[PDB]
């Protein structure tokens, strides 16, 4: 997260790491949205032009973290994955279409304070949230500029009106996708970036007080670049395909 | 950088 | 999905507010 702040204790308690065996290292985020289920980015585990494509046995998931490189004791939980799910047309070759994976964890995490699932949006908190100008939140544990943080970081940023995501950009955007960030004029900065990707723009509805996430961190052009955007998977678009993966292979 | 994680994770 | 999602123990569970979901809401016009 470029320009944002610390996290604070329990504040994003859907927040997962997702870290490699071997070297030890973060991959990326991801976000809890059941006990077994656990939402990413596509690229984070498929992405050839850069020789990626992560097994099962790859990776594993740490939820109820807030610390980046420290093992939190008593409070992380730690989950091996029983089985991915790549969105079956994901666009790696072009854009990122569909950059939305699923993660089935070999046992259920138990919940506490610092682990609590997310909701996903229906039709109408999308149509009613998804607005140019209304904010949202993303978190994650990646590059502080295009080092790197001692904990989670914070940042909310404004969804941006689409002709204007298009026209920062030579990338075709699809309906999968939307911009956030502020402007040049707006003073205000800050995006996602590198290590940040498959984490959670969130958004907390003023009608039921609950947090949605609303996107998923797919992609930018650089970060925090002026006059460029962050662009996050439509979460709601997806959501038919959540839930195949999730009445199929869910118990 | 990280530390280490308890190994029956592994 | 699950009908506790999206409340956090630590915050709409207890009735506490984070530092910045204000913000959140004052962009909700
Ligand atoms: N490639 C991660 C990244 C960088 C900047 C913005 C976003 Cl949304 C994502
Ligand atoms: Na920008």
Known sequence: IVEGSDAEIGMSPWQVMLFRKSPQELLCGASLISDRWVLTAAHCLLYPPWDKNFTENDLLVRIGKHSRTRYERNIEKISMLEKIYIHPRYNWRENLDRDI?????????????????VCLPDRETAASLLQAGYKGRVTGWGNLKEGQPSVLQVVNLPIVERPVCKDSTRIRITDNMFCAGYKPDEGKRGDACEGDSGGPFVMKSPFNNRWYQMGIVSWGEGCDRDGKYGFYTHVFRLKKWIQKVIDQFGE | DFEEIPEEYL | GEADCGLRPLFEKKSLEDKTERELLESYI
């Open chain 1, 101 to 117: 994976a699923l993660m089935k964890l070999k046992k259920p995490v138990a919940f506490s304070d610092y682990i609590h699932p």
